[PDB]
């Protein structure tokens, strides 16, 4: 009865690459997905035979590609970043921009919400990390010891006891910052390509990074030491930890590889149903991943404007 994943359905409605997917534990029937169509679609998970989900609302305030989107712990707000250089705080009840965050001079590539939602962190192509409050005021700007190339991903650690921020960039470095003084804490070297994503486990003890070099390295956040490297075999566009199982999911090229962290083995490889077409074009690239609240559903965004839904089905041998 090894666990397997099956395609339950796709979410249609986006007009550009689905860049990020966000889920909230409070609302199992609602997810958000950013896109290159400059909008964020709030979905209604009807789970009907005709459609798994339909678009319910669109957040239309960004003038360029939306890069990142995160939902609040309460689930009523959504922070978002864009290539317009600004962040937007959305009230999900009315779909309006409550607040705007200005100060980045280049495209914003990643935004994160603190565990207690009282802090906001963003990375931008201007090579800097900015820390904001909920009122739109940039309290601190990290330029000393910052990445020398684009900051592609910034994340918070879910563990409040360890207040750290993980940051990757195109300078092939993973940096851990102490949130107490906004100072560099650890500097992880070992990637031979630019980094695209970093994810932190639900217990705030392990970090996974990946990107151009195709290797998903795991770094201990408690001890600041390299642990293992998993061969993705393709450019890693997104990384995710299962909220309940010891799994690491990577959006490597057009497919998603799931790894059992205990055995360092591939549990499943989620390839799209490639039609027997004569087209020589590369299949759509998986660029985003998100696990549901209960960890039984995985949402993946692709470059064909779709959000494919994968279900954890107990597969009898």
């Amino acid at each position: 009865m090894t666990e397997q994943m099956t395609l339950r359905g796709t979410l249609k409605g986006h007009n550009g690459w689905v860049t990020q997917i966000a889920t909230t534990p409070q609302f199992p029937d609602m997810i958000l997905s950013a896109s290159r169509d400059k909008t964020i679609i709030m979905w209604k998970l009807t789970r009907d035979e005709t459609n798994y989900g339909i678009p319910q609302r669109a957040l239309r305030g960004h003038s360029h590609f939306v890069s990142d989107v995160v939902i609040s712990s309460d689930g009523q707000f959504a922070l978002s970043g864009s290539w317009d250089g600004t962040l937007r705080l959305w009230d999900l009840t009315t779909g309006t921009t409550t607040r705007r965050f200005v100060g980045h001079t280049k495209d914003v590539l990643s935004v994160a919400f603190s565990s207690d939602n009282r802090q906001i962190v963003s990375g931008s192509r201007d090579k800097t990390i900015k820390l904001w409050n909920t009122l739109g005021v940039c309290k601190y700007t990290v330029q000393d010891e910052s990445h020398s190339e684009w900051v592609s991903c910034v994340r918070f650690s879910p563990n409040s006891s360890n207040p750290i921020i993980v940051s990757c960039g195109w300078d092939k470095l993973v940096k851990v910052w102490n949130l107490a003084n906004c100072k560099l804490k650890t500097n992880h070297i070992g990637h031979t390509g630019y980094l695209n994503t970093v994810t932190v486990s639900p217990d705030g003890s392990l970090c996974a990074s990946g990107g151009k070099d195709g290797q998903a390295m795991l770094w201990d956040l408690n001890e600041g030491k390299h642990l293992y490297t998993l061969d993705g075999g393709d450019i890693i566009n997104a990384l995710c930890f299962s909220p309940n199982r010891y799994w690491l999911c990577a959006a490597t090229g057009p497919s998603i590889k799931i790894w059992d962290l205990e055995g360092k083995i591939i549990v499943d490889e989620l390839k799209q149903e490639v039609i027997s077409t004569s087209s020589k074009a590369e299949p759509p690239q998986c660029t985003s991943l998100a696990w549901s609240a209960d960890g039984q559903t995985l949402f993946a965004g692709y470059t064909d404007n779709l959000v494919r839904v994968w279900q954890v089905t107990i597969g009898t041998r």
């Binding site: 486990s201 639900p202 392990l206 201990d220 956040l221 408690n222 642990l227 962290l261 205990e262 083995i265």
Partner: peptide, 11 residues
């Protein structure tokens, strides 16, 4: 245990 501990466990 922790996620780091799971990786640390030998296969």
């Amino acid at each position: 245990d922790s996620y780091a501990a799971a990786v640390r466990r030998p296969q």
